[PDB]
Amino acid sequence: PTIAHGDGRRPSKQRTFIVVKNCHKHHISTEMELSMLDLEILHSIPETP
Amino acid sequence: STKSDLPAVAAGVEDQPRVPISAAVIKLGNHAVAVESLQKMYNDTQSPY
């Protein structure tokens, strides 16, 4: 918005401007281990307690 | 007479209905006074208060 002025100067023009922002991107990375034996026995079928 | 003329002085000022208004007030001596700041509108328009 703008105010009206009464002085000798030319009237103040109404102002609408364009504001452009940028979107940042963040990446997150976590490392985890699993030993080969931990992954192997999943395929085997256990019967004895 | 002042009482006879008071309707002539207030040319429809007492007729208009009244509405509550938001403003801070203080009691100084016996006078109640309204105190406020208008800087919001002038800050919104980038004009000097």
Curated annotation (Swiss-Prot), chain A:
Location in or out of the cell: Virion; Host nucleus
Top-level taxon of origin: Viruses
Annotated function: Self-assembles to form an icosahedral capsid with a T=16 symmetry, about 200 nm in diameter, and consisting of 150 hexons and 12 pentons (total of 162 capsomers). Hexons form the edges and faces of the capsid and are each composed of six MCP molecules. In contrast, one penton is found at each of the 12 vertices. Eleven of the pentons are MCP pentamers, while the last vertex is occupied by the portal complex.
Subunit-structure text: Homomultimer. Makes the hexons and eleven out of twelve pentons. Interacts with triplex proteins 1/TRX1 and 2/TRX2; adjacent capsomers are linked together in groups of three by triplexes, heterotrimeric complexes composed of one molecule of TRX1 and two molecules of TRX2. Interacts with scaffold protein; this interaction allows efficient MCP transport to the host nucleus. Interacts with capsid vertex component 2/CVC2. Interacts with the small capsomere-interacting protein/SCP.
Family, per entry: Belongs to the herpesviridae major capsid protein family.
Full protein name: Major capsid protein
Organism: Epstein-Barr virus (strain B95-8) (HHV-4)
Underlying gene: MCP
Parent sequence residues shown: 100 to 148 of 1381
From Swiss-Prot, chain B:
Oligomer status and interactors: Homomultimer. Makes the hexons and eleven out of twelve pentons. Interacts with triplex proteins 1/TRX1 and 2/TRX2; adjacent capsomers are linked together in groups of three by triplexes, heterotrimeric complexes composed of one molecule of TRX1 and two molecules of TRX2. Interacts with scaffold protein; this interaction allows efficient MCP transport to the host nucleus. Interacts with capsid vertex component 2/CVC2. Interacts with the small capsomere-interacting protein/SCP.
Organism in which the protein naturally occurs: Epstein-Barr virus (strain B95-8) (HHV-4)
Section covered of the full-length record: 347 to 395 of 1381
Family according to the record: Belongs to the herpesviridae major capsid protein family.
Top-level lineage group: Viruses
Function: Self-assembles to form an icosahedral capsid with a T=16 symmetry, about 200 nm in diameter, and consisting of 150 hexons and 12 pentons (total of 162 capsomers). Hexons form the edges and faces of the capsid and are each composed of six MCP molecules. In contrast, one penton is found at each of the 12 vertices. Eleven of the pentons are MCP pentamers, while the last vertex is occupied by the portal complex.
Subcellular location: Virion; Host nucleus
Protein name: Major capsid protein
